[PDB]
Amino acid sequence: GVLHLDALIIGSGFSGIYLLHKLRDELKLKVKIFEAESDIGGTWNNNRYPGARVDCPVPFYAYSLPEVWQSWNWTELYPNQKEIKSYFDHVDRVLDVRKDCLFHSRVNEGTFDEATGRWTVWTTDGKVATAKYLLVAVGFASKSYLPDWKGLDSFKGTIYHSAHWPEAEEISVKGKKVAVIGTGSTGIQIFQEWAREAEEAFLFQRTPNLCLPMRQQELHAADYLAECALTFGGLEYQQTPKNTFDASEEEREAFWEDLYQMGGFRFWQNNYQDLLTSLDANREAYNFWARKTRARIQDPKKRDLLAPLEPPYPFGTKRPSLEQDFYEQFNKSNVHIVDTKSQPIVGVTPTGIVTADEKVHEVDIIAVATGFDAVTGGLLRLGLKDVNGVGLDERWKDGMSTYLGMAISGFPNMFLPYSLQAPTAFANGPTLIELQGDWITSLIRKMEMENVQSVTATPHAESAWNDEVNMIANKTLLPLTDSWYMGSNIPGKPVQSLNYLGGLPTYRERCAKVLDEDFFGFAKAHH
Ligand SMILES: Cc1cc2nc3c(=O)[nH]c(=O)nc-3n(C[C@H](O)[C@H](O)[C@H](O)COP(=O)(O)OP(=O)(O)OC[C@H]3O[C@@H](n4cnc5c(N)ncnc54)[C@H](O)[C@@H]3O)c2cc1C
């Protein structure tokens, strides 16, 4: 019948499984996960496209729970999706997670009743549950956008959409002419895999992606995870506490070559402290990146499209993609880069893709690598309502805001790990997830001990958080990056939410104040 719970968790990714564990095992609550799709792992169950791979190195892209890490070993510094999914299998063997998940349970309505202090939640297939706490751990959905190109139904080959990548069987590209449309991380990853094996490979690029070198390595069979957890982003390092132009030119060059050789996010998060605050410092860094990247590319036309001497946006204002041998692919004669800023795609024929200049690029297989939605899309389809009955879509039509990235005014007893206005895209996920999950767990403990029936962020605390978020961003180069333009003007590009850029140590202090000052920023109601 109707399922009644202490807490209901939506999603079985890193976030929701951590919460299940803390709320069920540590707090001894009655808890279930409603999960939309077939199995655990979140984005790692959902996004199985070729090349899918982490961007944070072992051992950071993992839980810090000793029972989990005890017996696990990783085969390489930056594991792939299949190996992440096998880690989730390990988590389930250790923590016993699957038996408290209901799969194929896509939430499509939530409403809160102030008199009882409980949510009532419905799935698309008709499941219905009630719960005191609602933990919305939906991450970032895929962007399910198929551009209105003419002639797609005439195409004689096949079109795959990284919003629903097949599984069952790998798509073989041997002997095939292929196209990737899109240059976010998804596009970069698919293209690297496919450019290696396809008979011919076209990447359709509107803006260049400023990719950093991964430096992959094979690996072999507590205090350290604790000290890294104290950094800006939760990686092993943070910014170098010096201004760019306080170093001489030669010192800069040698410092940047060291970063670039270590690889991964060193160049982004171990760089000079004014990388993201001074446009000139930023441009000097960029000029380095371009020099190194262009040196890898033999054809001058390809070089200027992939790594222009003038930057397309301030480097580091977005989470950079990583790459292994992407730029080298283009030195093959059958590997092409098509500039769709200049010559947009205007159509598909039976044999290929047609650009505005009427050039036909013949292919057998097309991957649409639209990449991820803003955080907004996925949360708005939940059909959540505030206590006055208003949909979150309507609440947010004029801009989205939150308290701490984790609560929304008028949605009581509802918490959002790994979501907007939180350190999210500027941090290591799992470290933020555990931080928010621990906090949510402590906040629930506190309510249960104090007999608090509901807590709801106040419009004031929300507006104040939004003002801190904005103020931190205003001091950086973020207002000058091209994301905002694209979201406001360009069809298919969703409006992004600002991350909190204050760093995990400040973010922690803001969270702690809630627990130490009597639910500071929330209105409370008692049982
Ligand atoms: C290829 C790739 C590589 C990445 N590597 C890194 C990295 O190295 N470092 C890092 O910091 N981040 C990384 N990320 C970002 C990654 O999203 C997060 O690290 C993290 O996995 C998010 O976990 P989550 O559980 O919050 O969200 P998700 O993993 O997205 O899980 C959300 C869950 O909610 C479910 N869901 C959505 N809607 C509903 C609904 N209506 N009802 C029921 N369930 C629903 C989804 O099906 C899903 O199972 C990577 C992302 C990808 C795609």
Author numbering: 9 to 229, 240 to 545
Please quote the authors directly:
Amongst the four BVMOs described, BVMOAFL838 showed the best conversion of alkanones with chain lengths of C8-C12, but was unable to convert most of the cyclic ketones tested. BVMOAFL838 has a clear preference towards aliphatic ketones and phenyl substituted 2-alkanones (aryl ketones where the alkyl chain is at least two carbons between the phenyl and carbonyl group).
The crystal structure of BVMOAFL838, the first of a fungal BVMO, was determined at a resolution of 1.9 Å. BVMOAFL838, similar to the four bacterial BVMOs, displays two Rossmann fold domains, representing the FAD and NADP binding domains, with the isoalloxazine ring of FAD positioned at the domain interface. The catalytic site Arg337 and Asp63, implicated in stabilization of the peroxyflavin intermediate and positioning and guiding the cofactor and substrate during catalysis, are conserved. The Arg is located in the “in” position and forms two salt bridges with Asp. Similar to PAMO, a bulge (residues 442–444) protrudes into the active site of BVMOAFL838. Partially covering the substrate entry channel of BVMOAFL838 is a loop region (residues 449 to 514) of which the first half forms an α-helix structure. In BVMOAFL838 the mobile/“variable” loop adopts a position similar to that in the CHMO “closed” structure, where part of the active site entry channel is closed off. In this conformation however, the conserved Trp502 (W492 CHMO numbering) is positioned away from the active site and the NADPH cofactor, suggesting a rearrangement of this loop upon cofactor and substrate binding.
